[PDB]
Amino acid sequence: EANPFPLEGKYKDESDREHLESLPEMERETLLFERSQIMQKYQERKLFAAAGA
């Protein structure tokens, strides 16, 4: 499974970063929260896979 947000742990790539940086503050913070949940689940799966689950 590939890291879904490899740029600064929060963005897909440069155009995605620029898009999020152009948004209103509330929308940006909501998307960053959503992405932090995605990243936690990604890391948890990576950990379980490394242990042989």
Measured distance CA(16)–CA(4) in Å, rounded: 12
Domain extent listing, the chain: 1-53
The string of DSSP letters for 1-53 reads ---S--BTTTBSSHHHHHHHHHS-HHHHHHHHHHHHHHHHHHHHHHHHHHTT-
Experimental method: X-ray
10 within 8 A of 40, measured Cβ to Cβ: no
Do the beta carbons of residue 20 and residue 28 sit within 8 Å? yes
Residue 8 tokens, joined: 């600064």
Sign of CA dihedral 27, 22, 36, 46: positive
Residues facing residue 7 across a β-bridge: 11
